[PDB]
Structures are given as C-alpha cells and as structure tokens.
Amino acid sequence: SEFDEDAWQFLIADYLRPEKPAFRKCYERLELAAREHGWSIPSRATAFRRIQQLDEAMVVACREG
DNA sequence: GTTTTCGCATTTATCGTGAAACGCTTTCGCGTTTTTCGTGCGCCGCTTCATCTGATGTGTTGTTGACG
C-alpha cells in the first residue's frame, strides 16, 4: 500500500470527528479533495479494512462522552 | 545399471484491489384517518312591567345699599 499520506490522514481526521460522517460520503468527499490535490487513493474496501486494523478503541475515541 | 537429487513446467490457489451486491435501519411520501376547533342555532329560565326621579355644605362673586 503506497498512497498519499495526506489523503489517508485527511480521511482519518474526518472519521475521528464527533460528527463521524458516513464512510461512503466522507470517502466521496475525500475523492473530491484527492481530485483537487491529485492524490492517489486506495480501494474503499482496503481503507475500511485498515480502519478495522486501527482499533475498536478508535470508535469510542471518536464519539467518546 | 539403479537410485536420488536438481532444474524446469503447468496448474491451482489466493490475495489485494476496486466496483458492486445485499440487508438493515431510517425517513418521507402520499392516500386515507382522527381529533379539535369554530360557527351556529334553538331553548330555557329569570326577571320586570301592569306608574317612576334628584340633593347638600362652603366659598366666591356680584349687586345693591349705606355711608362719607
């Protein structure tokens, strides 16, 4: 997996927000940003896969209260 | 000459990826539903007509009489 760290970081930054947008819309939006910066994005499946690879703790980390 | 290892080939397995399929929950969309809100009228009970309406005390002003 060799892709723009900026895009990956952008997506993670968006998911960990208490807003927690839909993975599909956040991803499409990410595609728009990637279009603007010319970033090469990975497959949605791989992205979600790695989101699974982070931690369960991340889900509470986002919406913690 | 008999066995064992080494080099090459074909077939199958699987991954990583990307676009994709399903299934769950969430909403909104429209036809038919349910309650509340006004407008509306009619009835009943109570009440008056068979006979009903104005003052006082104190202060100020004006006029008239008396006095100079």
Sequence letter at residue A37:
H
> What would the two tokens of residue A53 be?
């690879």
Q: Which tokens go with A44?
A: 């949605």
Tokens 């939006």 belong to A29
Measured over the CA atoms of residue A48, residue A54, residue A59 and residue A62, the dihedral's sign is: negative
Is the shortest CB-to-strand distance from A44 to strand B under 7 Å? yes
Residue A61 carries which side chain, given as an amino acid letter? A
Q: What are the helix (H) ranges across A1-65?
A: 5-15, 23-37, 44-54, 57-63
- Cβ count within 10 A of residue A11: 22
Instruction: Evaluate if the CB of A46 falls below 7 Å from strand B.
Output: yes
CATH number at residue A13: 1.10.10.60
* CB A53 under 7 Å to nucleic chain B: no
Which domain covers residue A62, as residue numbers?
Answer: 1-65
- Phi, then psi, of A22 in degrees rounded to 5: -60, 140
Max intra-chain CA distance, chain A: 37
PDB resolution in Å? 3.7
> What experiment produced this structure?
X-ray
**What's the CA–C1' distance between A28 and B31, in Å?**
37
Task: Collect all residues with Cβ–Cβ distance below 8 Å to A34 and sequence separation of at least 6.
Answer: A4, A7, A40, A41
Number of separate domains in chain A: 1
